[PDB]
Amino acid sequence: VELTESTRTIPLDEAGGTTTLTARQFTNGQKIFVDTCTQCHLQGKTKTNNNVSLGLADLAGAEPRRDNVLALVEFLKNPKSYDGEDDYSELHPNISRPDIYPEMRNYTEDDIFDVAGYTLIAPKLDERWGGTIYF
Amino acid sequence: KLPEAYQIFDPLVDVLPVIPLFFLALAFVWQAAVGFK
Amino acid sequence: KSQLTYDDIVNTGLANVCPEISSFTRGTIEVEPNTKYFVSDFCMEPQEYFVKEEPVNKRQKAEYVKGKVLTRQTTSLEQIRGSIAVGADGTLTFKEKDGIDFQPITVLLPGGEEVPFFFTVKNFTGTTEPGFTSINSSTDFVGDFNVPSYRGAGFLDPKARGLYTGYDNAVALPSAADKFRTNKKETPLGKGTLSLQVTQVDGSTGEIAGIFESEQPSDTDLGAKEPLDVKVRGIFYGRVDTD
Amino acid sequence: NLEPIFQLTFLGLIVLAGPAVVFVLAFRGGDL
Amino acid sequence: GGRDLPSTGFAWWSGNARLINLSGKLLGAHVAHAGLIVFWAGAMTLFEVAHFIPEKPMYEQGLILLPHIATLGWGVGPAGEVTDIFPFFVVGVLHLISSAVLGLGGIYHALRGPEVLEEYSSFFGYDWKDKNQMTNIIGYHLILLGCGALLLVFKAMFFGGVYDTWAPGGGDVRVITNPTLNPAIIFGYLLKAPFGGEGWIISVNNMEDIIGGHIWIGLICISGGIWHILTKPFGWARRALIWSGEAYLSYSLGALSLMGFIASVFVWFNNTAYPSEFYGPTGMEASQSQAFTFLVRDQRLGANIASAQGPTGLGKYLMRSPSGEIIFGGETMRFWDFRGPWLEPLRGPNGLDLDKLRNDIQPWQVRRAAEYMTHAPLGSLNSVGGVITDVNSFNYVSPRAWLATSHFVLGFFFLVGHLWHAGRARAAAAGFEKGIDRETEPTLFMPDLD
Amino acid sequence: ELNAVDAKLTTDFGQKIDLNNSDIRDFRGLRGFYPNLASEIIKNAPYDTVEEVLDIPGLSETQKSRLEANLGSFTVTEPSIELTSGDDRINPGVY
Amino acid sequence: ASLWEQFCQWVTSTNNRIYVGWFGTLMIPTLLTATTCFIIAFIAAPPVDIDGIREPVAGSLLYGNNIISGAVVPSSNAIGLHFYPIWEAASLDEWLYNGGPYQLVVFHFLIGIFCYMGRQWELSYRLGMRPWICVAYSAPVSAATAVFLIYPIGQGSFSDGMPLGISGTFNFMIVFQAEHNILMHPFHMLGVAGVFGGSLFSAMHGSLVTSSLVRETTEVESQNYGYKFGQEEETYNIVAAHGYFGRLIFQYASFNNSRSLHFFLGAWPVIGIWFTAMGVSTMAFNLNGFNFNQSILDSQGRVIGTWADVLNRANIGFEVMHERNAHNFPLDLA
Amino acid sequence: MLTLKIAVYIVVGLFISLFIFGFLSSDPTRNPGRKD
Amino acid sequence: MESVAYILVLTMALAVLFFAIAFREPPRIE
Ligand code: CLA
Ligand code: CLA
Ligand code: CLA
Ligand code: CLA
Ligand SMILES: CC1=C(/C=C/C(C)=C/C=C/C(C)=C/C=C/C=C(C)/C=C/C=C(C)/C=C/C2=C(C)CCCC2(C)C)C(C)(C)CCC1
Ligand SMILES: CC1=C(/C=C/C(C)=C/C=C/C(C)=C/C=C/C=C(C)/C=C/C=C(C)/C=C/C2=C(C)CCCC2(C)C)C(C)(C)CCC1
Ligand SMILES: CCCCCCCCCCCCO[C@@H]1O[C@H](CO)[C@@H](O[C@H]2O[C@H](CO)[C@@H](O)[C@H](O)[C@H]2O)[C@H](O)[C@H]1O
Ligand SMILES: CCCCCCCCCCCCO[C@@H]1O[C@H](CO)[C@@H](O[C@H]2O[C@H](CO)[C@@H](O)[C@H](O)[C@H]2O)[C@H](O)[C@H]1O
Ligand code: OEX
Ligand SMILES: [Ca+2]
Ligand SMILES: [Ca+2]
């Protein structure tokens, strides 16, 4: 099928919010993901710690749930531990620390929104997303 | 990237490094023109 | 290892040697009646290995046999942290806490049998006689320690059989798969006995050195066979924090 | 856009250059 | 000289052999080829600059020349952050223009310049059998090579320094004030075993040794240059060697094959002359980084990584080297000779130190280990990064991989060329490179074997 | 004959989160547990009953509340060294 | 005249039944050392802990192997790239347990084969031949060096050298494919073209010469007796062979120059083997075969499989099982 | 072990020296063609 | 005892090699 509006329709926030990426928003999100995230997030996994993957179940199990776009953007601004207790802004790339993550200092809020949307859309296109490292 | 004043010749610098391959090919062109004497 | 650097130490074998205190050393470490003292960098360097051979006759003395190490200078426990507590009567209790407290070691015996064993001091609690108001050349810490299975429960045998992973049957023989006793893997927690004869105490710096003899079982290969009895004699060193 | 267009312009000019030299020498009687 | 098979005896596909005795034409070929080399340097540098995103690491962008400039201390600061992009551009521009000049000269000599130089000048005219003249050319070029080594030294000492990945406070461009001229260190490098843990000269691990060895190399080359200008080959050399143009070519081919192999190994293993800041991690570095990353993660999870035994009974995270040193466990046991600026702070005299591991690990070391582990020099030919079973979304092949593979291949084929030309030079000197003479076929005058 | 881990899978261990035997990945389903509270739980094992998990020394009020909230998911079995030795509760070789 | 001169004339003598030469003065000792150690180890070596995990692998006949399964096992992963001669072992038993025989045999064998190539040049020089047979032999030498030295160097351990055994060779190849996708590497494809084409050209050349043999015998005796060793005349009709072949395909695809034909016969397999040796040598630095995994996406973005994806599945199946106890961490970087 | 190491060192040194001095002994002259 | 068979066949091949070299049919020019 086409990359339909429903395919691009993803939860926007935790209160039932819903947003639809445009084809261009999705393509730029994919491009950014391939450029800076696939390093340790190839196929939705996490090479450096695969207890915390990009799969929908892992994303929804985080505290608070990260399976919506606002939570993803918030994590990308201020990364935290999976139970939301430890501050990982020294340990995960984020736009808030351009001094240690320069690979990210050129990204806009639109760019982070797009990559978060892609992180939410890619799992429904690949059953292997967020699986075991060899899978 | 190239310093700002030079980015109108950006699509020229894109093809510069591959020229010595053309030199190697040109050797064969020249030998073909002379009939591979 | 004396007081060198890793550049001086690399590829020499000194990294597998427990430090020694001195020669003009006959000090004693005073201890309070009911306080406990930390042990900082406890080291054990084995030097002799004996395996109790099992006669086929019966009822006859088994005679520990000297083995030779096939694994290289990879046989020493070090950077171990512990504690020594002084009982009400004067007992001294040495308790291992953590560190590099195990080394797998394979010894060759006369006849060609190779004996791997899990040389360790894990969870060793050992005691002296009461009435010790000092740590000195007569301090004997005799006690017990735990010996985990040599192979962990994640190990796979050459037929991909294991305990919490792998097959539970001989898959290469489809009509005889469930026939073999080794289809069941086991990791019993074996038991060891150790004695720590303190022979040299430098109470100024708190370092204690001495001799040890340990008794423990060998590898069973996940319960494939009965463990042999392995005896290890060596030397040890550690710092005791007085304050 | 236009980047492939300009790239192919430079590439084609460069490509023709060598054969142009050989052709001119051959036609004008130069040493080859 | 002739320009066809009847008048030269060489087909078109061996046409450059027609140049063996045309010294002016040969000089033109050499100068034009040097123009090609300098042209590639300049054009590749400009391409890399144009295709450079200066806030992304060099090794993530398929750059092999910019790291060479950065290592020399141009355009970079602490940790390898690209300060000024202009010096890279200048290196490229200068090489391009000079290549134009060299190509003009090579074309002049190859096409119109005098065919041979010997009746034009004794200084530039040469004969391959003229041993004194050949040693004169050796002497001139040795003087030049020593001068170039001293240029490296002068850049490191008096012209802003070179990038020192081992600098305290972080890797940085620093000026080398105390090169080690001590010949014990310099020439004991040459005596170290070419095996694991020794690393014959690949193991040079501090810029002081590199600069001091380059001072020694400069002096050796200049003195040898004078020695060869002022002497002729001795009797033993005359009796041992073939004295012909093709023989000298074969000698140089053997030398080049050796250097190509050495460079491939050098870039694969050495992280001092090839800082990981610009070239990415070595394979050893990436393996050690993965071990460190999971030691750190599991320790944060509460694992007591000193006492945790793996499935086989060896320590999961830590173990002993065969000489007793405390090393990372797992398959990376093979890489325990690795030394890197991010890992040495956790190393004690006995190897990895439990106290430092438990309380001295810095967040920047964790970040560096994660980066190096995820940029391991593994990748497909079409530049798909990671292990070969990974899927297509990571576009990365380490510059170390490109350089090492390319230069091993070039070293091998130059060994082949050396064999070809050495055998041919011997046969031609003895006069049977054109085949067996039917009249005097040597085997016909030999006793039968059995 | 089941070895010992499969025999554990016969028990409540194979049905829910065992406080004495489950690996730390098994706690990820409980929101707010992995990794901090899960590591704290594994550190303070064994527990004779599920209720003494609330008696972890140095526990925190939010952690107390989370443990009370998810008491239902927990069971306690005899700590089998098969699952425990070598820090396999932290890293059983699964990624 | 002098003693040394007499020795020189003996070593470089073309009247020796086996030419010795100066390269032979190294070849003979090293090759004999390698052969004796290999035979002894293959028969009777005790098990070797190849993966450095105290998991010894039995390679010798006396420890339960047959000829197919027997091998000289590569040295331990714990050794890595360290030099492990006999005199660095505490005992011979330790040396054997850590795979020292592999290092001894391999190093001597490599020196021997390089000296064999030099010796080929040397004898060609002494006999007044052209010098390039050794260049052809440099292809198998390059391949052997790639699998015994270069690949272990790039991978960082002699445990990742090819075992000296039949089944060990197969294990090497399977793991190599799992880790590098050598089948999808163009240099290995060129090697396959080299050997397939070399066999093809061997079959054609032999069959065309045999087909065009000049009649010199009767129907009883072997046609081979129609050729006499050292005869000046040609034993087959190359013109008839050219007529046949140039009509089989077409005229201008057939060699009528025997010299060009034989150069082609030499060059094709040699070049192919050079390329495949370089392929292994560069996969030693993990520059692997082509990766087209999930290269084809449908319009929505779902992956459409190709045969490359099925191949990748097979590779993963090999990858997850190999050296099943050796890996502690998720990525197989070493 | 040390005796073995010394013996191997001598044997290898002798064979290498043989190879070197052999190729230094006017080897290009040892051929059936031209000796110049 | 199948080790004996393996050793036997290998030794047969090696002996064939030595005889084929040492006691070969001499090539003779006639
Ligand atoms: C500095 C190094 C060097 C120099 C100066 C020479 C010089 C010479 N060589 Mg030589 N050679 C070398 C290295 C060198 N070689 C190496 C490394 C090898 C091993 C492969 C050889 C193998 C070799 C052989 C077999 C022969 C020579 C011959 C010659 C003589 C004539 C060759 C000629 O006309 O070129 C002509 C050029 C061509 C025909 C074009 C060849 C193109 C090659 C095969 C492919 C190029 C691939 C390259 C990487 C680019 C890839 C392109 C890709 C994009 C498709 C000449 C004096 C001949 C001789 O002996 O003369 C007496 C000869 O028979 N060489
Ligand atoms: C680096 C590569 C290289 C170089 C420097 C040379 C150089 C040379 N070759 Mg040669 N050759 C090569 C590769 C090379 N070859 C290859 C790959 C082959 C196999 C096809 C051959 C086969 C071959 C044969 C058969 C012969 C030579 C010959 C020669 C010599 C005479 C040149 C001539 O008269 O032709 C004339 C060609 C022209 C006049 C055409 C134009 C050439 C110019 C230089 C083109 C430059 C274009 C450039 C972009 C313009 C920039 C100019 C400036 C503004 C910078 C000369 C020194 C001849 C020789 O040996 O002389 C005795 C000879 O017979 N070569
Ligand atoms: C190694 C390279 C090289 C060599 C050996 C030669 C050699 C020769 N050239 Mg040539 N040339 C070259 C490169 C080279 N050239 C280049 C790149 C160009 C393009 C600019 C030219 C253009 C050229 C022309 C137009 C002519 C020659 C001529 C000559 C011949 C006479 C030289 C002479 O006495 O004049 C005098 C030499 C000097 C006054 C010395 C000056 C030295 C240079 C120019 C100053 C820079 C020195 C520098 C610091 C040293 C290192 C260089 C640096 C790049 C590292 C001679 C055989 C002439 C000839 O063939 O006679 C009929 C002739 O007319 N050349
Ligand atoms: C590229 C640079 C270069 C080149 C081409 C030459 C070339 C030559 N030099 Mg030399 N030389 C140089 C640089 C160079 N030199 C420098 C920089 C110095 C100053 C130190 C010298 C000092 C020097 C002296 C004192 C002599 C020469 C001599 C010679 C001539 C014969 C020597 C020989 O056969 O070599 C090959 C070497 C041998 C055959 C000896 C064997 C050496 C060992 C056994 C080989 C083992 C190498 C080993 C495998 C490699 C490992 C690397 C490392 C660990 C050692 C020859 C034409 C001789 C001559 O005739 O003078 C006029 C001579 O007496 N040179
Ligand atoms: C001999 C011969 C040959 C060869 C030739 C050669 C080898 C050559 C060359 C040459 C060369 C080697 C050249 C060159 C050139 C260069 C140039 C011409 C340049 C330039 C410039 C420019 C123009 C630049 C510009 C720029 C700048 C300034 C900066 C910015 C960017 C740009 C780029 C724009 C052959 C083989 C063919 C054959 C025949 C014979
Ligand atoms: C810079 C540097 C350095 C230094 C280095 C050096 C100082 C060096 C050197 C080197 C050298 C100084 C070398 C060499 C060489 C040699 C050779 C390479 C040789 C040889 C030989 C030959 C070739 C021979 C041959 C022969 C024979 C065998 C016999 C007969 C005759 C003949 C001739 C054939 C260091 C590392 C410190 C640091 C880093 C950097
Ligand atoms: C699409 C149609 C088919 C396209 C075909 C493309 C391939 C055609 C051949 C490619 C060029 C080969 O080039 C060919 O080389 C031969 C060598 O025998 C030379 O052959 C010629 O040489 C010279 C030309 O200067 C003549 O004097 C001579 O009589 C003639 O034999 C020529 O240089 C050219 O005829
Ligand atoms: C003909 C060619 C020339 C032949 C001449 C060469 C002869 C052979 C020389 C070899 C020298 C012996 O090499 C010597 O080995 C001893 C072994 O005890 C090393 O000794 C060192 O390591 C060994 C372990 O092997 C320790 O037990 C010893 O306590 C320590 O000092 C020395 O550091 C080294 O100097
Ligand atoms: O050793 Mn024989 O193969 Ca080369 O990859 Mn890592 O190392 Mn082991 O794991 Mn897969
Ligand atoms: Ca990155
Ligand atoms: Ca561009």
Ligand SMILES: [Cl-]
């Ligand atoms: Cl395997």
Ligand SMILES: [Cl-]
């Ligand atoms: Cl591992």
Ligand SMILES: [Fe+2]
């Ligand atoms: Fe034939």
